[PDB]
Design a binder for this molecule. Sequence first.
Ligand SMILES: *[C@@H]1O[C@H](CO)[C@@H](O[C@@H]2O[C@H](CO)[C@@H](O)[C@H](O)[C@H]2NC(C)=O)[C@H](O)[C@H]1NC(C)=O
Ligand SMILES: *[C@@H]1O[C@H](CO)[C@@H](O)[C@H](O)[C@H]1NC(C)=O
Ligand SMILES: *[C@@H]1O[C@H](CO)[C@@H](O)[C@H](O)[C@H]1NC(C)=O
Ligand SMILES: *[C@@H]1O[C@H](CO)[C@@H](O)[C@H](O)[C@H]1NC(C)=O
Ligand SMILES: *[C@@H]1O[C@H](CO)[C@@H](O)[C@H](O)[C@H]1NC(C)=O
Ligand SMILES: *[C@@H]1O[C@H](CO)[C@@H](O)[C@H](O)[C@H]1NC(C)=O
Ligand SMILES: *[C@@H]1O[C@H](CO)[C@@H](O)[C@H](O)[C@H]1NC(C)=O
Ligand SMILES: *[C@@H]1O[C@H](CO)[C@@H](O)[C@H](O)[C@H]1NC(C)=O
Ligand SMILES: [Zn+2]
Lengths: 588, 643
Amino acid sequence: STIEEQAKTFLDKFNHEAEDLFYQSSLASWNYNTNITEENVQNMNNAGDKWSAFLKEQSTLAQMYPLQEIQNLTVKLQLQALQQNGSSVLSEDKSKRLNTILNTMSTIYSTGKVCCLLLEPGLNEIMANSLDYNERLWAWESWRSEVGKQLRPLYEEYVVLKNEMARANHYEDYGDYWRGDYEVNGVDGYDYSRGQLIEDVEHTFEEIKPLYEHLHAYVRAKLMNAYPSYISPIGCLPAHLLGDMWGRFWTNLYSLTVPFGQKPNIDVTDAMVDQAWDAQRIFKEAEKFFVSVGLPNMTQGFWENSMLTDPGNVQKAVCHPTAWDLGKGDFRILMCTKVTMDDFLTAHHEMGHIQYDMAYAAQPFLLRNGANEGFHEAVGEIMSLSAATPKHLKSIGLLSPDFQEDNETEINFLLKQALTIVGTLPFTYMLEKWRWMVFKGEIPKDQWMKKWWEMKREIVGVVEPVPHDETYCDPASLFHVSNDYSFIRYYTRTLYQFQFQEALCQAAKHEGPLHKCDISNSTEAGQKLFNMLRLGKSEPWTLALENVVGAKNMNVRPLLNYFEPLFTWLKDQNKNSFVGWSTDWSPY
Amino acid sequence: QCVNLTTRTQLPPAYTNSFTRGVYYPDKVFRSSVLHSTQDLFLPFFSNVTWFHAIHVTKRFDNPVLPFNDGVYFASTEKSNIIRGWIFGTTLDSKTQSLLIVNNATNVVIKVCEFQFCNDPFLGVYYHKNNKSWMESEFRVYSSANNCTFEYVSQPFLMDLEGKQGNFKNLREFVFKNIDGYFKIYSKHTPINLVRDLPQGFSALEPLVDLPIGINITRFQTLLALHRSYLTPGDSSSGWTAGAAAYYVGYLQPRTFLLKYNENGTITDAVDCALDPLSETKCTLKSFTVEKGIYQTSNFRVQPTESIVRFPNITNLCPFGEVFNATRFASVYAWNRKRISNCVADYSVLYNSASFSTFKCYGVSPTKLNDLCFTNVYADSFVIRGDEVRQIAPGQTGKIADYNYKLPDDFTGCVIAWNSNNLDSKVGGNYNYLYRLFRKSNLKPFERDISTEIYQAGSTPCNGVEGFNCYFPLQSYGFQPTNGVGYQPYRVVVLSFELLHAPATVCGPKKSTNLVKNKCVNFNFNGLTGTGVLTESNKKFLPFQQFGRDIADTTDAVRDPQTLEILDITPCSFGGVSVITPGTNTSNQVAVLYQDVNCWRVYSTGSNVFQTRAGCLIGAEHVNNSYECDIPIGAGICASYQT
Ligand SMILES: *[C@@H]1O[C@H](CO)[C@@H](O[C@@H]2O[C@H](CO)[C@@H](O)[C@H](O)[C@H]2NC(C)=O)[C@H](O)[C@H]1NC(C)=O
Ligand SMILES: *[C@@H]1O[C@H](CO)[C@@H](O)[C@H](O)[C@H]1NC(C)=O
Ligand SMILES: *[C@@H]1O[C@H](CO)[C@@H](O)[C@H](O)[C@H]1NC(C)=O
Ligand SMILES: *[C@@H]1O[C@H](CO)[C@@H](O)[C@H](O)[C@H]1NC(C)=O
Ligand SMILES: *[C@@H]1O[C@H](CO)[C@@H](O)[C@H](O)[C@H]1NC(C)=O
Ligand SMILES: *[C@@H]1O[C@H](CO)[C@@H](O)[C@H](O)[C@H]1NC(C)=O
Ligand SMILES: *[C@@H]1O[C@H](CO)[C@@H](O)[C@H](O)[C@H]1NC(C)=O
Ligand SMILES: *[C@@H]1O[C@H](CO)[C@@H](O)[C@H](O)[C@H]1NC(C)=O
Ligand SMILES: [Zn+2]
């Protein structure tokens, strides 16, 4: 009969096979992640092979239904998410050359021999704490001269192959294929282009520039004292002094750039050690915070099946904090919890991922995901943003009751957050504008290094301590660049992280600035949030955003409001020093 | 030793009237500011009580043995503590067991033994002239008491025993009942100032004691006391005076009363609902005040008599242990059915097993089904996921209630479902339970299609092989132990109850009773309830029918379920009765209209019997004038309250 009615039947037949093969693969992956032994790798590969071959054949079947006749808009989305040819459109010969390139890049980055020192924790510890001008220059140049030198010829072939693969799938370039996640079509009034993402990414960064210029001049003016005569007040910060190998996070600069040194912060590790928290109470406190904001309880199987404490030396397991959703109503958390405030925060973060995965369990198989790629981490972060305010720790038994707070503490806190949040936005924006320019073809193959260090000085204000010719490949050192991952998810996660927080702090009727707003004991805010967690991917992300914040586009105004006291204090501190930088001064 | 009292003048017995006496609290629940109806054994209002004296002047030391029919109202007007107790029994001669309740000068003694009672039991008080004092000397009640089962002695007290000269000063009212091995006593004491008769007024008796004696009381006898002095000359059998006292005896009947509770919780007034038609309208309106008008009451009243329940004599338990504890439950797409017939089946234990996740019933109340009669019972048992249990209900939709198992809207059964993860899930998957996924059309209520037709989902002929657009319609559930609640295996049993014209076959449990005729009795045949006279019928029906119904569709001929006879039903009597009142505020006089009497099936004849086309009117004077209509009687006849 009609294509729409025959398609609804095909998808009814599909979801039933898919749910069971997916769960059979997730269980076999969990078994190896908790028991890192032999024979488990083979079951991991077999369960990941049957799923891949079944999905490949079912995707070949999906094509036979033309997509113009279907008008439901839901079956339209499932068939769109299924009919994508992916990389198979490339010929047989070049698909193994491309996968060989990918394998070689991952291998050449994972095993880097600097002599002999590897990366973790060989060069990372030197770069993060040496505080010697030349030792960290050797530890920087060595990596940029070995791992970046062995990846130069390969990335030139990776670019052209991925470009032809993206051109075959009706996109313009691989940059467009990446950009195509933030695309909504057919819903009148809510449409979004793939040319629209380049915009708004520029009219939001050109609106956050003043806070970054004042944070930069304060960091430079506080870094001039440590390294005596190597930094100049007009010039930019050399690249090896930014507290990280790639200068991605400025957090390690907080050991020097303390506004008020004497006052400490709210370290509550001793409070939990005193009361003998048994590495399980933390998750119960998280569950009670979620129960109080209004959402449903934890499923029973979570408590028995999940591994929440390292099994010891007899059983070894890789334990990077993770929340597992295995389908068929099965949820688990994998963490080696230890009694520290850091694990008290990560428990609420992972529990917010678990609470996001329970919401859309009613949706079909292909629509069980976040509205777009930058929504899971915003949800997981706002809960760890609210569960850190001193008022909340005061509500809980720890954090002894009186503890009056003063402003001199809130400036220390805000600057320790600003170095982490508003220091990585011009690096994410510059890196993801370089890769878009190189993929489009704007940067010829003879200007790859000459233009990177002209983006640096104009956007990030970071000069190089030794000039790099055309032969080098600096960006290929980063984990995301060489291993072929997207990077604009971290520019939108930060903005969504604070528009959610403003909207839900408003709905809780809190009065005062946002940096100490709490959400617990406010059922209305929880209902407001669950009204968008429930949709899953079935609705356009502009509609999913409008259900919480009230706008159809991403903004930067709430992020600026969060940092208003810090911005004023910095605007007063810098007046003796300079503001802004100059592109001419280079240390060499 | 026992002495037969002589020198007692014999007089004919005396009778008097009870003026709304003998009301007691029926239960032990506090109520306030309410009218409450209750059916129990009461002394009827304005009854005929017997009267007994102890008056010296004649002697007349009355102490007859009296019947104990269904319980006794005993009233005592005293000033000198003459009435001392009672003996209750059947033969009172040591062959059977008897109950003694006596108040001796010091204690209250309650004994249940085999007494050889004296022919003339009594107590003796002696008065000394030289020092003024009355003391108890004689206790002449029984010769021997051998096998004693129950005994009670109260704490010691000193009683007065002094002879008084005024009029009666104390009224003591008791009610005695004997039900299911318990002898129940209610009582109340009242101050009075009178000389003779049972006084007017109202006072409810309160529960006093409840003795577990377990004997067969049929008769009783009052125990009195004697006075002896120097002015009482003679031997033991003649030298005795009496001392004034009086007591009254009435007998209780099953009646319906409307009791009134004030705002403090005391019964201050009552209505006997079967005394008069006026009282019946009071009872119906549930008020003590009746406004002016004409009211329909009820047919000739024979009162409550006895209650019978008649059920089929079948004592075989139903296989409810085989459907629920079945070893192998069946796939949902090909479910099972078991018809349980000719069986007495208990559901309360099934209800309280408390192992069930969901137990819901439709068209049947959860507790009533314990005592009901159906023609057949079916049981459909299968297995589904936890989430789709919601679809097992009338008027639901989904992949289960469309292509697997469809229920009708008028469902008379009970859905039971309980998780069974432990039994029928295993590691790696339990892929045995298949369910239909694709079907051309929805399933009619209670129909099973277990075919494996290849679903031709499009336009091309499928030729009998699957592939593109030809789907096999049975898909298999995947159960594992680690799944969520929503994906875990629930076993479901759906009971269905069907009723036809055939003779009942699933009825129980409930014990039956005897069958009585020619009285107006309450009956329960196969779950049908009714109140009427059951009469033997020399008639027959066709083998497939059980009840007969008239033009109004009420049951007139109900076949007994044990012996398969036909028993006709006639209401208590067959009459038409109406009541005319000018208002209880104005007067208590009423008129009664009998709509089917030509003037005799009347409650009382009186005078002023007047015949109208509306019926026979009793209690109204007929005048030759013609006024405007005040109270409509009918057929042009009206009534009024005039001078
Ligand atoms: C949300 O409301 C609950 C009330 O149930 C608060 O819990 C109380 O917290 C105080 C602070 O230590 C305790 O002394 C009380 O015993 C807790 N229970 C009750 C019933 O008062 C909880 O603190 C509130 N949330 C916040 C953030 O204050
Ligand atoms: C881990 O794998 C080994 C390999 O056979 C097995 O013996 C052991 O039982 C596994 N661990 C657990 C907890 O089952
Ligand atoms: C699309 O189909 C689903 C069922 O598969 C239905 O619930 C939904 O309403 C349909 N969409 C529209 C717009 O009707
Ligand atoms: C995938 O390749 C097939 C091969 O002909 C083509 O018909 C189909 O349109 C391609 N899919 C897309 C989304 O272009
Ligand atoms: C769900 O949470 C409420 C609120 O704390 C609690 O009372 C209830 O027992 C919980 N139930 C389960 C099954 O966890
Ligand atoms: C607030 O912070 C400033 C920053 O130096 C400090 O000078 C001041 O004393 C603090 N307290 C008040 C009340 O301003
Ligand atoms: C079924 O088996 C259980 C367990 O032995 C038992 O308690 C129960 O009485 C049996 N019958 C029913 C109807 O549940
Ligand atoms: C039981 O019922 C049958 C009905 O046919 C009857 O014949 C039989 O006498 C009854 N037995 C009794 C009442 O003991
Ligand atoms: Zn996370």
